[PDB]
Structures are given as C-alpha cells and as structure tokens.
C-alpha cells in the first residue's frame, strides 16, 4: 500500500471518530439551550454524517456556541477526508496512466 | 433488579438544607442521563434537571428557582441532588430518572418523599383491629391495622411480607396537632383465619423503624 | 418551551370499552412523545415510547398515535388495573417538558358498602388511648356518609374521615372511619355505633358492639 | 377491463377471521401499492392499510386498532386482507385500491360487504310485481319485483341483464327478524309490454345463487 491509499484509510477511519465524537460533544453542547433539538444521539449521529458530507438538509442544526465549534470540525473533517479520498484517486490514475504511456 | 434507588423519606427544617440520593445499577452507558423530577401531592410532574455523570455537566428547568444542584459520583454510580433553603413549597416526592439518551425515561426511582417542617420525627404505634365478640361474619372476614401518631410521610403497609396483596388497601393519613393517622384494610376467606396467620407489617422510613403486628381474635 | 396540553383532565368509562388520551403541542414536535402511567402511590411507568412504539412488558391493549402536534393514547378494552394518571411527555426540543396529566375512570356497578367496625385494642388501652375504627369497603358511586352513635346519641367529635381513590383492583371505592377518645371518655360509655348511608340502600348499613 | 376484483360478500360469525381477496389485471409495475379502505353504511372513508407485493411489506393505521394482516401472491397477482376476531363493528364494506406509489387512488374494487353476525344465510325469494286487472296505464307502464326475505346483504338487481337501465331504481332494504327485504321498480312505455319482454335478474353473492324473474300480466 502506498501514501496516498493510507492517508484515504487514516482519514476515513478518523472520519467516523469525528462523527461519533461530535455527536456526543453535540448533546452535550445543545442540552441546556432552549429550544435545542440536537439533544438526543441517534439523530444527532445522522445530523453529524449530513453535516460531514455537506448535504445540511436543514433539519437539524446547533444553535450554542460549542455545539456550532463542533460543527465546523466535523465540516472541515468530512470536506478534509473526501478531499483526501479525491487526491488519492488522482495520484492512482496518474501512475496508471504513466504506464500505459510506457514512462 | 432495581436499577434506581432511593431513600423514603427525608426531613428537613425551613431554610435548612438536604442531598438526595440516587444509586443506580444495571447497565450503565457513557450516553445515560440522570433526570430529577418534583411532584406535589394532588399536582402532575414537573421537571427540575439533568446530569451526565459521564461529563458531569448538568442543567436546569429555567422556568423554576434554581434550589437544586446536581452531582454525581462515578465510582459508586450515584447521583446527588442538593436542596438548599427549603420551604414548605419545597414538601414533595422527588423521582430520579434514567434517559437513554433517546429522549425517554425508561426507569424511574421509588421516589424520595421530602417534608419541610420544624416537627420532630416521630415513630408509628400500631395498634390490630381484630373484629368484637359479638360481630357475625359472612364467608370473608376483615381485619385491619391502626398506624396512629407518626411523623413524617410516609409509611408503607403490607401484610404477610406482601404475599398478602388481594383484598387490601389502605387509606391515606390524616393529619393532626403534626401527627399522622392512617388504617390499613385486609379480607380474608372467614376459614383461614385466624388457623392461617395474619400479620400487617408497618416501614417508616423517616425513623428507619419497620415493626410487625400479629392480627389474632380478641381473647 | 414546549406546552403539552391534556384534555379532558378526567376521563369516566365503561368497563371494557375504548378509551383514548389526548396529547396537544405547542409546536410541531414530530413524533417525539412518550407516555406514562402512575398509579395512586406509584412511580410513573413508561407505556409507549416514540408516540406508538410499544414497550417490553406493557399490554398489547396499549397504544398510541399521532404525529406533529395531536398525539393520542389508547386502551382497547378499560379493565380495573389502567385506573391511574396519564402523562405525556415531549423529547423534541430542551428542555423536556411534561403534560398536565389524565385521570382515567371507570362507571362500574353499583356496589354496597361492606361495614366492619373494631373496638380500640388492647395495647391502646394501656397507652391511655381509643380509637374506634370503621371500615365502609368496597362501595359504588363513592357518594356515602357515615354517621357515629354513642348509647344512642349522635357523636361529631373526635371523628377523622379518610378516602382512597379509586380502587385498580375492583374499581371501587372505600373509606374509614375513625372516633378517637381517650380511655377515660372510652370508660363512661357502653354502645358504639357505625352508621353508613349509601344509594345502594334506602335503609343505612349499621354495626356496633357493647364495651361489654 | 376490470383491473380490481373483489368478492361481493363474506358472512362472518362473531369471534370468526375471514380472509378478503383482491385480483388485480391491467398493467402491474414493481411501484404498486395494493391500499384496503373501510366504510361503513352511512359513514365516509377511513385508511386501513397497505402493502407492496414487489417487496411484501406493509404498513398500517396507527390510529385504529389493528384487526387486519395484508398479504400478497406475485404468481396470481391477487391481495389479501386477513380480518380476525370481528364484531359487529367490523360489519362495513371493504374496497382495495391501487395506487402507482405517487400518492392517488386510480382505480378502486367495487367492494366485498362483510356482514358479522350469528345468523345463517339465506338465499332470496323473487316475487313478480305485475299491475292489477283494474289499473289504467297512461303513456308508461310500471312493473317490479319483490326481493323478499334474505341474509346478508346485499343483492345485485339489474333488468334486462344490464341493457335495461333508465327508470329503474331499487329501494334499501329493510330488516326485520334476521331478514332483508327490498324491491326494485321499472318503468318502461305502456306499449312496449308485455310484446317486449321484461325480467328482472336477482344476485345473491352471499348464496352464490343468480335467478332470474319474468314479468308477465296477471292471468
Ligand atoms: C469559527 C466560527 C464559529 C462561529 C461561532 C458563532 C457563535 C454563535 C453563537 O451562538 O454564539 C453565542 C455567543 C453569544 O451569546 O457568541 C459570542 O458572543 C461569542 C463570540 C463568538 C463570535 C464573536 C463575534 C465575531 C465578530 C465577527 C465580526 C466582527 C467584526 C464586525
Ligand atoms: C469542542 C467542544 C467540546 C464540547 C464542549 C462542551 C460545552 C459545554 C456547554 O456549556
Ligand atoms: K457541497
Ligand atoms: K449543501
Ligand atoms: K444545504
Ligand atoms: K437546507
Ligand atoms: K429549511
Ligand atoms: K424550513
């Protein structure tokens, strides 16, 4: 295995502590906050993975400061970890077609 | 087993202060939730906290006075919760509560019957109540139990260690000059008794007191 | 915060018929509900969870529905044991919140009183005390007076009522009694009376016993 | 053709299951849903269930207690309604409904009356109802017949096997001592009849019997 599909393995598997962690630390950030509703975890685990690909459909967001801190680092984890996955994929097609042009 | 446990009863002086106790067993996660709830005789449930004893982070009904304070101990999976400056609106049975983390209460304590008062805690006398020479009886016969003069709330009445649960129930106290009063009921086929014992036992938590009164005809 | 509105406060019923408990919300919350019960002297007990997702252990009897802001809990078929207070509760947004509660009742048969009266004990006695405890159990409607006779005369003095709920085995309800004196007071009498009035009777359902 | 088919009638004791069936044609795709829809005489439509038979699952009204299983057979294209432990406030016509998964009701079966109730069926008594020797008769003439003494419902009455449709219209039954009865009226131009001829077809689905009865001028 070379770097560029190690560094892919390490981000997806950091990925998902990002996405475990953050829906822990979440509840507990919103608990407290009126009017909160990421304070239970199952959804808030959904509500990390929307959160970590982008899609925020909007039905569920923080509203504390904490719980929004944690937000951009599941953010910045997931466009990181997809980032990481798309050089890899680059760097393989690369080579591939390094030997194909027989260099 | 019971997976939440706590005191009967506790008794305190106005504006003096109490730390409820919450000991919980059974499977214990990094997501639980211990919750408080205060009920009023008569009244429905009002919520008055929240505390992960995994974080130790705890929060409030904001729409109460604040005169509770939530810790909680993991080593001996306990939750606390202090009552500071107490008043007669403060007398109440207090629950604690178990969440998930999924929203709902899945299990709730026996309830911790607070008083506030400045009376002095008094033991019950119980007295058998076994039926006059001269009264006839039918293919049931009633016996009773007379828990007179105790202070505070509650007792807890069962007859024959709780094997004895059809045909009974027993009637809320009275209360009077700080003293309370209560009757507790038992019906029995006529030919079991009194061949086959009858006894009431009587637990008052407030002066960690539990007696027994054999239930036997009037010599 | 969210307000969760139960009415009515009282439900009466038929045994064996259909009940159904209504839950509002002050908001849509989804179906994030979760219902209760509690007995006279009891601890709440879950029932339904998520608004209709049933619980190991709760009758099949038992379900619930509903979703946004209407939520409703049902009984198929009333029977003695569902006689207790119905509380919802919302998990949508902090902090929970709780609904004021309904008392479910049940308009069964018509019962007469079963009257047993008890001269004080013996142990009682000796403490400088009386008690005189009458038993009026087991009776339908809960509607009923009693009245206590000393030798003949009506008594009012040193007599403490006391009355149980609704009872969750029968349905039924009871009450005691309760003429307190001293020993001395005790002494200067011979015949006490327990009087009970009940609908069930045009003739009140009497017991007494001489000191004798 | 018709894309929906169901039983006219099922008789069920109370206590009994009974087990309704629905036969669809026409074109079938793998986003069918297969609905079942209750109503009962007097009473507007209420949402029982659904199921999709290219996967079996199904789901059902929460609102409601739960007397129906659905199922389904791919090899026959046929829907099940499984109906257990009925009263008789489980007596109500039941249709089956197709629905293309985008969220309408395109086509309905025409419906099987389930009637709940200990008495035992009885196929009908079809009387003629020809005018007497003394009536006059203008420009048209009026004729029936007489749908007497059967159980459950209902009955399908037609004149002429469907070709003779304006001026007719049969009354609702009547029920008295565990028997319905109803009769059905015709109109058509006095000199049409008897040279042309009228008959009126009866339909018992719940006897599986069909007769047929001419009207002819009394001898
Ligand atoms: C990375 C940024 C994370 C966003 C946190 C937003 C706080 C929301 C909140 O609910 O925070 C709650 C809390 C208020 O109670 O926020 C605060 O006050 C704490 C201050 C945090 C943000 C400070 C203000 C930034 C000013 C940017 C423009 C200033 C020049 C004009
Ligand atoms: C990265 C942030 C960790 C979670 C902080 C908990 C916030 C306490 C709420 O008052
Ligand atoms: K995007
Ligand atoms: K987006
Ligand atoms: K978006
Ligand atoms: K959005
Ligand atoms: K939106
Ligand atoms: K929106």
Same mark, same amino acid.
């Given at each position: 295995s ?8 390490a ?5 998902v ?22 304070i ?11 959160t970590?690909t ?5 039905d569920l967001?923080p509203?504390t ?18 980032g ?9 097609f ?10 | ?22 000991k ?5 996660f ?8 205060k ?5 429905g449930?009002?919520?008055?906290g ?7 982070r ?19 999976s306990?939750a ?9 609106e ?13 929203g ?7 309830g911790?019957? #607070?008083?506030? &008062?400045?009376?002095? /805690?008094?033991?019950? @006398? !119980? ?9 006839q $009886? ?28 059809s ?6 106290? #009275?209360?009077? &000059?700080?003293?309370? /009063?209560?009757?507790? @009921? !038992?019906?029995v ?6 061949s086959? $014992? ?21 010599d | ?39 006279t002297?009891?601890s ?16 099949s009897?038992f379900?619930?529905?509903?979703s946004?802001?209407d939520?409703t809990?049902?009984i ?24 004021s509660?309904?008392?479910?009742e ?6 007469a ?6 001269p004080?004990?013996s142990?009682?006695l ?25 030798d ?15 009872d ?33 009777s ?11």
């Amino acid at each position: 295995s070379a770097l560029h599909w190690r560094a892919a393995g390490a981000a997806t598997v950091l990925l998902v502590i990002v996405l475990l962690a953050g829906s822990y630390l979440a509840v507990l950030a919103e608990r407290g906050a009126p009017g909160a509703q990421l304070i239970t975890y199952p959804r808030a685990l959904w509500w990390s993975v929307e959160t970590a690909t982008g899609v925020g459909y909007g039905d569920l967001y923080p509203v504390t400061l904490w719980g929004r801190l944690v937000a951009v680092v599941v953010m910045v984890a997931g466009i990181t970890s997809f980032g990481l996955v798309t050089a890899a994929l680059a760097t393989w097609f690369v080579g591939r077609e390094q030997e194909r042009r027989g260099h | 087993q019971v997976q939440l446990q706590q005191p009967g009863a506790e008794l305190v002086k106005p504006g003096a202060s109490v730390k409820l106790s919450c000991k919980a067993s059974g499977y214990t996660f990094t997501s639980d939730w211990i919750h408080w709830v205060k009920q009023r005789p008569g009244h429905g449930l009002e919520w008055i906290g929240e505390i992960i004893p995994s974080y130790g982070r705890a929060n409030y009904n904001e729409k109460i006075q604040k005169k509770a304070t939530l810790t909680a101990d993991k080593s001996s999976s306990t939750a606390f919760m202090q009552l500071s400056s107490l008043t007669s609106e403060d007398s109440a049975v207090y629950y604690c509560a178990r969440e998930r983390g999924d929203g709902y209460f899945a299990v709730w304590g026996a309830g911790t019957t #607070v008083t506030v &008062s400045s009376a002095k /805690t008094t033991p019950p @006398s !119980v007295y058998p109540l076994a039926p006059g020479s001269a009264a006839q $009886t039918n293919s049931m016969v009633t016996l009773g139990c007379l828990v007179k003069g105790y202070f505070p709330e509650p007792v807890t009445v069962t007859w024959n260690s709780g094997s004895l649960s059809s045909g009974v129930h027993t009637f809320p106290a #009275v209360l009077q &000059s700080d003293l309370y /009063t209560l009757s507790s @009921s !038992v019906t029995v086929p006529s030919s079991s008794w009194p061949s086959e $014992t009858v006894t009431c036992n009587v637990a008052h938590p407030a002066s960690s007191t539990k007696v027994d009164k054999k239930i036997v005809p009037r010599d | 915060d969210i307000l969760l509105t139960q009415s009515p406060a009282i439900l009466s019923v038929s045994p064996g018929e259909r009940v159904s408990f209504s839950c509002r919300a002050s908001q849509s919350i989804g179906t994030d509900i979760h219902w209760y019960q509690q007995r006279t002297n009891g601890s709440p007990r879950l029932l339904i969870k998520y608004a209709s997702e049933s619980i190991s252990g709760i009758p099949s009897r038992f379900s619930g529905s509903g979703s946004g802001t209407d939520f409703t809990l049902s009984i198929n078929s009333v029977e003695s044991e569902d006689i207790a207070n119905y509380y919802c509760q919302q998990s949508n947004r902090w902090p929970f919140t709780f609904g004021s509660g309904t008392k479910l009742e049940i308009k069964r048969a018509d019962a007469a009183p079963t009257v047993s009266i008890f001269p004080p004990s013996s142990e009682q006695l000796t403490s400088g005390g009386a008690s005189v405890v009458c038993f009026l159990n087991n009776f339908y409607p809960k509607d009923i007076n009693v009245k206590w006779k000393i030798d003949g005369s009506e008594r009012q003095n040193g007599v403490l009522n006391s009355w149980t709920d609704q009872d969750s085995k029968d349905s039924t309800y009871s009450m005691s009694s309760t003429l307190t004196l001293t020993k001395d007071e005790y002494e200067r009498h011979n015949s006490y009376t327990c009087e009970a009035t009940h609908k069930t009777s045009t003739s009140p359902i009497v017991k007494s016993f001489n000191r004798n």
